[PDB]
Amino acid sequence: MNDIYKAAVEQLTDEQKNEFKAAFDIFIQDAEDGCISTKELGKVMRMLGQNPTPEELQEMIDEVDEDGSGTVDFDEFLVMMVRCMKDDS
Ligand SMILES: [Ca+2]
């Protein structure tokens, strides 16, 4: 049952739409596609409250990135939140 990932994004709060959107806007400032740079997610995690490595952060990105285009969309961005809260246990 992987409906929990979509169920949360369907009834999420405005704080979530602004929490990630804040970093999303700064990272997607010079971009015109609608996605941040997965490789530059190190600056995102640090802002979120985590300071991992470039090899470790890339792993969690590819995991949340359903397509794995090397870019995190707002949908993939907010997903990472629920993915950490609930996914295994
Ligand atoms: Ca993607």
From TrEMBL:
Keyword check for Nucleus: no
Highest rank taxon of the organism: Eukaryota
Primary gene name: LOC100136178
One Gene Ontology term of the molecular function aspect: cytoskeletal protein binding
Name of the molecule in the record: Troponin C, slow skeletal and cardiac muscles
Function of the molecule: Troponin is the central regulatory protein of striated muscle contraction. Tn consists of three components: Tn-I which is the inhibitor of actomyosin ATPase, Tn-T which contains the binding site for tropomyosin and Tn-C. The binding of calcium to Tn-C abolishes the inhibitory action of Tn on actin filaments.
Keyword Iron recorded: no
Domain EF-hand: 52-87
Family: Belongs to the troponin C family.
UniProtKB keywords: Acetylation, Calcium, Metal-binding, Muscle protein, Repeat
A single cellular component GO annotation: cardiac Troponin complex
